[PDB]
Structures are given as structure tokens and as C-alpha cells.
Amino acid sequence: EIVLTQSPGTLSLSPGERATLSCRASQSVSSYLAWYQQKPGQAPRLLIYGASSRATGIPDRFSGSGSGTDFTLTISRLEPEDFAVYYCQQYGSSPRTFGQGTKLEIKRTVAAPSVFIFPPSDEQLKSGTASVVCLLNNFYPREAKVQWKVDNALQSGNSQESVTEQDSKDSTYSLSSTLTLSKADYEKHKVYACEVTHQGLSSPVTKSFNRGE
Amino acid sequence: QVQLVESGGGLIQPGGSLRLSCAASGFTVSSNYMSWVRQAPGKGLEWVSVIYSGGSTFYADSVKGRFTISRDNSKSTLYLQMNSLRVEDTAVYYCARDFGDFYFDYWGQGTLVTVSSASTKGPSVFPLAPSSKSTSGGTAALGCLVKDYFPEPVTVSWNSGALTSGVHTFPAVLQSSGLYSLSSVVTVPSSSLGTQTYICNVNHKPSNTKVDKKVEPKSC
Amino acid sequence: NLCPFGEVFNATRFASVYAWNRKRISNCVADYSVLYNSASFSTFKCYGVSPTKLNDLCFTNVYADSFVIRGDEVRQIAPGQTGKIADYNYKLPDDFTGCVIAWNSNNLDSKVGGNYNYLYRLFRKSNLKPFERDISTEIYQAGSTPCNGVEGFNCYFPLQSYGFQPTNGVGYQPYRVVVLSFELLHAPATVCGPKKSTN
Ligand SMILES: *[C@@H]1O[C@H](CO)[C@@H](O)[C@H](O)[C@H]1NC(C)=O
């Protein structure tokens, strides 16, 4: 059973730079290595077979090299289309196996998020549940910390986060943090606050509301 | 011009059966190697099964005895019959042209298979109203909370497709209850709050739920 | 005289598996000693017969088939197997009566640039019958448009080369294979073992 390990897990570069992606095999597979490209929501696409031969229609900036246990995929001048996930696959020994993928991300300048907080709607409150939403809009890099403070008590274990894919036009990310609680518990508290830490902020940003205002 | 279109994915209980189909054109199905490859949500690629040009059949160890690959050349279609389905089988399933059992040079679009004990459920749609305070000459945020649905997917549009700039529809996350929930937001000028109308259109085909929620600044 | 097993096992060059060789053995004394005592074979599997006991049986004819595959594929040279070799190159019947012998030949059949003389059939619309040999090199029409003898889209060369290299892992290295099959026709037996002798 051949295990493929890709490095690095994530790679962040500007358009125009050179990208170098590594695949390492637990055993020799000698030349029986392929590279695929996958954009979000789309199917994988064959880039390279036989470790070095390009598939039909693949631009010249994609090249593959290596053998045995070490393989490399190089993109010479990164175009925007090229920012995607890349998978190595071996076919030297059954069963064929893939690597876990390398994600190629667009690098840009730091952008601080804009922060918004949303109290639960009254319609939702009438069904017995309260969801408080915090929105971090159009920031970079992707690392951010969102902290819920209810009546100045740090809340833990009852919130979930979701992060968009990198935006096509400004290359930023957006994030939603949702705090869920019962109607009774929601009416047990007064001040609801979202506290955001991000590299683009010299100090954490807090958005707050008082219940019933 | 090779084309592959998969169909048949949907919600199924553990132990149930499904048949996925792949409609192919641009080559002779009976003459080629063909494979099924699957991708669990947020995970990598796993080869599932292969049919040789001469008809021989091979399977990954995790599906041996439960899955069966087959083809019909007059219909130009490849089939995957899945029986005794397990939760681990949840994935997007891809149909693929296979060059000599080596690599996959043509892929379909994929079909989502969800294996779960959870029942189909339509979402509740709640507004995320634009803030009282926002900023007189600045930008405001509003959106729709799409909560407690199953299975995937939902589609969200704003103003029947007219509003697309500044829209972020977040990926669905599975809650403790085993149901999905999701928010779609958009940033707009605060001036526009009193002159433009904002309506989120939510559709959930697995439950035949369709909702049009107007999002309005809330009474103070 | 003695049966010419040596010129099969010790041949300078072997055939490619798609064009496997077959030697018809007749009207000789076969002493299988040479084989089963020699600790030189990584594979010596016999079906419906034992090597110890061959030396006292008689047959109308014996067939010795020989070719080169990679070690990975030696398992496919057996009754009831499937795979590219079994399906499109060399097929044993389910009621096979005989022996399958193989040994690593990296020291003879690998080259530093890669040995592209040994080939195998990759594409075929249907599986071979037992002991069928297909040496066609016709362009494989994978689609509806005829290939007219030119490789291209949906038009594949049916054969592929192994490219044996001495650096390869042992699963990818060339293995020489000899398959002995024994046929009992309604006819006099011409291939037997030895025994005592007068004068
Ligand atoms: C091939 O030659 C070697 C050495 O000359 C010998 O030991 C071996 O028996 C020969 N093979 C056969 C089948 O006799």
C-alpha cells in the first residue's frame, strides 16, 4: 500500500511567481506518477502523466520532474486560474493511491476585516432557539480569532465557524461565527459581544448589542 | 469531445442501496477502461472501482462485496450499484475515463451521495437585519440565516439573481443535532437601506422547500 | 534422447508475453530432476500433478511456454486469475494440469537506459481464450472514428513496453517464466521418465 505525502500543505504566492509542489512516495513507483488540478466545486483535471508528460491542452508553464520516491510539479509563471488544489497519484502498484493535496493560495497585502453582529430575529425567538451571528468581512490573511463574550463572560463550546473560499476579485476571506443557545438562556443574559483579533488590527475589535434594544 | 455526466446521488439510510449512472459520449464505453473515484466532503480522492476494456472488474478493499461496477454500451452508460451502504460511503462520486488502469484523463462532474440515519428536513429562513446604528454615509450588512436542513445542498440568491456584488454565502456546517445550517450575507450602502429592497431566495430541492425572505431594518 | 528442457530454460533471449513462445516436446525422455532439485526458482507451482511424481508418468506431448513479465504479475500466471496479463497476454485454463516456473532475471533482461524490447498488450476488446496468442499490432480504436493506422486521440498503440531497469524495485523487475503443460491424447505416449538399463 503506497502512501503519497505532499508538501507543503498550503502554499501562498503572488501571481507571476514560480510554484514548486512536492510529492513523496513510501515506496518507489519509478515513473508511474500523475498530477491533477482541482478548483473548488469542480472535478479534478489531469495535468501530467508519466511524471513528466503533459496531458492534451495543458499549458507549457506546467512541468513535472522526478522519479522513484521524489516528484515535483512546477508552475513557472503563476496565473490566477492556477490557484487550486493539486493532487499526486501513483500507479506503480495496486491499488492506485492519491496524495492528500496541496492548496495554492493567492498572497496579497494585509486587509483588516469589517465586523458586524446580528442578534436573533424575533421569528426565530418564537421557535425557542436564539442564534447570534458575527460576520468578519473581506480580510487577509485567513487566520483570525473570534471570541464570544456574554455579559463579559467568555463563551466556549456553543459556537461554529465557517470560512469562504478566497474571493475571485480581491483575494480576501470572509468568516461567520454563529453562537447558538436556547430562548430561556438567551433571555438570561443582556450584553452579547463578538471580539475579533486579526493581524490587520492593531488591537482587537468588539461589536456588541444589548438584548432587547 | 469527451463528456461524462453522473446522476443518481442522494440521501440513503445505512444499509440501503443506490445505483449511480454516468452518461458518456465522445468514446466507446465498451472499448475503454472506466473507473469510479470518490471524494469525501473536505477530504481527498479515493479510487473505488474499475472495469477493464475486456470486461474484468476490480474494487477497493473498503467496498469489495458491496459495490458492483457495470456498463451498457448501447446506452453508452457506466453504472455503480452500491449495496449495504455505510456512513463512511458519504462522498461525491466521480465517473472517469481510465487510460489502461493507470491514470484518469477525463472526469465527470460528480454526484453527491449522503448515507445517514437523519431524515430529510427543510430549512427555516430567518433575517439578519441591518443594524440600527450602522453609519450614516457608510456601508451596512444584512443577510439570511438558513438553519436546520438535511441533506445538502441549498441554493441562495439575492433579489432573484440581480444582486451578486458583495454577497458571501458561507459553506454549510453540520450542527450538533446532525442538521446543516448556513448564512448568506451582503454588504450594501446605508443610504440604500430605505430605497432598495433586499430579498434572499432560498431553495432546498431534497425537501421541496422554497422561501423568499424580505430583509428589512427592524422597528425601534 | 533427452528432452531439450535446457534450451527453453537457458535460452539467451526470451519472448515478450504478448508473443509468448511455445516448445512442443515429443519423443524424448524427460527427467524433471533438473528442475525440482534446483534451488534457483522463486516460483515453482504445480496443479493437478506433483514434481516428485512426474518422473514416472507418460504423456503424448508436453508444451513448454516461456516469456518475460514483471514480478508483480507472476501471480496472474495461474488458473482463474484476471488482470492485464491473464486477460490480454497469456491465459491458463481453469482445469490447468501442469507447472508454472519463474525466476528473477534482472541480471539478464534489464538495461541502464531501460529495456524496451519486452512488451505486453494493454488494450483489447475481449479476453483471450486459454492458450490463445494474439500478436496483432493494429492501432486500437477506442472511439467511433477509424484510426487509419495513426496513433492519436481515441487511437492507442495496443502494446506497451516494460522498460526494465536494474534500479527498479523487485516488483517491477523482469521475471522469466516457463509453463509446462501435459496433454494426454488418445494416442501412444512419447514423453516418459527414465528407469533401469541393461548391458
Ligand atoms: C542451465 O545451465 C545451468 C548451468 O550451466 C545448469 O545448472 C542448469 O541445469 C541448466 N538448465 C537446465 C534446465 O538444465
Side-chain angles (χ1 to χ4, degrees):
Chain A
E1 155 76 331
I2 311 271
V3 174
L4 300 175
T5 306
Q6 295 186 242
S7 87
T10 308
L11 185 68
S12 163
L13 305 165
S14 323
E17 299 193 73
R18 166 174 288 246
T20 287
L21 295 67
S22 161
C23 186
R24 181 170 43 80
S26 69
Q27 290 181 47
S28 189
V29 292
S30 148
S31 70
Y32 309 131
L33 193 291
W35 293 89
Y36 303 85
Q37 179 193 69
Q38 176 168 56
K39 303 159 180 171
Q42 296 189 18
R45 160 172 80 137
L46 179 69
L47 290 180
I48 275 166
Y49 62 96
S52 292
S53 319
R54 271 191 291 285
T56 313
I58 300 313
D60 313 88
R61 57 183 190 273
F62 292 89
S63 65
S65 89
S67 58
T69 48
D70 297 284
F71 305 82
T72 279
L73 173 76
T74 303
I75 308 155
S76 58
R77 238 197 107 87
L78 228 42
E79 289 279 289
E81 36 270 42
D82 305 339
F83 293 91
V85 180
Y86 293 87
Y87 287 103
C88 60
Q89 178 246 314
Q90 67 88 12
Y91 48 97
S93 147
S94 324
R96 296 171 288 181
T97 50
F98 300 78
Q100 287 328 295
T102 288
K103 200 201 184 42
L104 203 36
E105 176 216 62
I106 298 201
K107 175 122 192 53
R108 56 149 292 158
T109 54
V110 174
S114 56
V115 184
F116 302 84
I117 189 166
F118 295 101
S121 76
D122 288 309
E123 195 197 334
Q124 183 188 22
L125 281 169
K126 292 194 312 234
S127 75
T129 292
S131 290
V132 197
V133 173
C134 185
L135 163 64
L136 276 63
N137 199 63
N138 285 62
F139 58 90
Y140 188 91
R142 188 225 290 273
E143 307 87 75
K145 175 162 98 192
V146 178
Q147 220 151 270
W148 285 99
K149 269 167 150 88
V150 184
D151 280 329
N152 221 65
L154 166 57
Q155 281 303 293
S156 147
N158 55 342
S159 54
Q160 288 185 302
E161 296 194 344
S162 163
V163 184
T164 55
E165 291 286 329
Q166 198 166 27
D167 189 82
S168 69
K169 302 198 205 100
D170 64 8
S171 279
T172 62
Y173 297 97
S174 288
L175 184 147
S176 60
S177 177
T178 307
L179 178 81
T180 323
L181 58 170
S182 56
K183 180 187 178 131
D185 191 3
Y186 175 66
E187 300 181 0
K188 272 270 169 178
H189 312 291
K190 185 63 77 147
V191 174
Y192 290 82
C194 179
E195 180 179 291
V196 175
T197 304
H198 187 263
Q199 175 180 344
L201 308 161
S202 49
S203 191
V205 168
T206 298
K207 286 312 153 140
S208 183
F209 71 85
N210 315 305
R211 172 180 55 74
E213 283 184 17
Chain B
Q1 49 162 25
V2 182
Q3 281 173 21
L4 303 154
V5 182
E6 303 94 336
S7 81
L11 174 52
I12 181 76
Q13 314 183 189
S17 306
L18 252 73
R19 199 186 60 161
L20 313 176
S21 96
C22 170
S25 69
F27 64 100
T28 314
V29 173
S30 90
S31 277
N32 286 262
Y33 296 74
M34 285 201 81
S35 266
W36 287 96
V37 182
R38 73 188 174 178
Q39 178 172 48
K43 294 264 139 202
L45 297 163
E46 180 186 24
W47 167 80
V48 181
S49 183
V50 69
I51 185 95
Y52 277 25
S53 60
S56 272
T57 40
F58 303 89
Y59 302 96
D61 289 333
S62 44
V63 314
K64 207 151 181 193
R66 306 162 42 231
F67 289 19
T68 299
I69 193 174
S70 65
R71 47 178 187 208
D72 186 319
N73 190 64
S74 64
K75 299 182 164 78
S76 211
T77 296
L78 180 79
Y79 302 99
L80 193 69
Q81 177 72 43
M82 299 147 76
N83 300 317
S84 310
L85 280 162
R86 313 157 170 176
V87 165
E88 314 91 80
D89 299 317
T90 297
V92 173
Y93 282 71
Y94 294 102
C95 156
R97 210 163 169 275
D98 188 323
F99 185 87
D101 198 20
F102 295 147
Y103 47 90
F104 319 100
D105 49 5
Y106 292 102
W107 296 64
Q109 252 294 91
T111 185
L112 177 62
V113 173
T114 308
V115 187
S116 175
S117 284
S119 279
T120 303
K121 199 176 166 282
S124 314
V125 181
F126 304 116
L128 303 158
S131 158
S132 77
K133 298 107 167 189
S134 325
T135 296
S136 178
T139 77
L142 58 96
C144 273
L145 172 61
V146 190
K147 193 169 160 53
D148 293 337
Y149 68 92
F150 196 81
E152 287 271 51
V154 292
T155 70
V156 192
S157 68
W158 284 90
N159 284 355
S160 317
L163 177 54
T164 57
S165 307
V167 174
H168 296 299
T169 295
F170 287 93
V173 178
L174 282 152
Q175 301 163 108
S176 318
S177 60
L179 302 163
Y180 286 98
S181 162
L182 173 162
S183 267
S184 177
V185 305
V186 61
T187 43
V188 299
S190 307
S191 47
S192 289
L193 284 189
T195 71
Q196 177 68 54
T197 296
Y198 297 108
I199 297 167
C200 79
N201 327 103
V202 175
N203 173 89
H204 185 243
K205 292 292 174 131
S207 75
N208 187 37
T209 301
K210 319 183 70 129
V211 174
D212 292 305
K213 195 78 192 187
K214 194 220 295 165
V215 184
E216 52 185 78
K218 187 231 261 193
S219 285
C220 278
Chain C
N1 210 249
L2 295 324
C3 290
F5 282 134
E7 78 185 42
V8 172
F9 283 85
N10 278 347
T12 287
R13 214 82 91 183
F14 267 49
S16 292
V17 64
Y18 84 95
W20 48 275
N21 269 137
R22 157 165 286 188
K23 183 59 163 88
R24 185 169 184 272
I25 293 314
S26 98
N27 280 115
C28 52
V29 278
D31 185 13
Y32 308 96
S33 68
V34 178
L35 315 170
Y36 57 77
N37 289 341
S38 177
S40 35
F41 301 122
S42 56
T43 288
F44 205 114
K45 278 181 184 93
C46 295
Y47 298 83
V49 56
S50 147
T52 74
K53 294 240 163 43
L54 274 168
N55 267 359
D56 45 59
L57 277 206
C58 285
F59 297 100
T60 323
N61 285 302
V62 169
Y63 297 107
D65 308 333
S66 38
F67 49 87
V68 165
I69 53 180
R70 68 183 221 187
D72 267 9
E73 299 160 336
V74 171
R75 53 158 268 279
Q76 289 183 50
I77 313 302
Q81 295 302 301
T82 63
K84 286 176 250 195
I85 304 304
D87 297 351
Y88 315 133
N89 294 269
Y90 184 86
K91 178 60 162 173
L92 286 184
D94 292 342
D95 61 350
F96 175 62
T97 307
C99 299
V100 174
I101 310 161
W103 62 97
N104 186 296
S105 63
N106 198 42
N107 293 328
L108 307 163
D109 293 310
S110 278
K111 298 185 176 180
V112 170
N115 194 340
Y116 298 108
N117 285 351
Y118 286 111
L119 322 164
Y120 69 97
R121 188 175 301 280
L122 182 58
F123 294 97
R124 202 176 192 268
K125 293 184 159 70
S126 66
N127 298 351
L128 297 174
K129 283 143 100 175
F131 297 123
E132 179 176 9
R133 176 180 320 124
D134 187 345
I135 53 173
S136 210
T137 67
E138 189 184 359
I139 297 303
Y140 187 84
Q141 180 173 338
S144 54
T145 87
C147 297
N148 294 328
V150 187
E151 302 175 32
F153 175 78
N154 283 352
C155 287
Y156 310 142
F157 202 80
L159 307 186
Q160 277 243 346
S161 158
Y162 278 109
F164 292 121
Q165 285 185 310
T167 56
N168 283 153
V170 69
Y172 308 104
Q173 281 175 18
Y175 276 69
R176 292 185 168 198
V177 179
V178 172
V179 180
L180 306 179
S181 47
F182 309 93
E183 74 158 354
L184 273 191
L185 257 45
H186 174 13
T190 45
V191 188
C192 302
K195 204 53 82 154
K196 72 221 151 73
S197 35
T198 303
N199 276 341

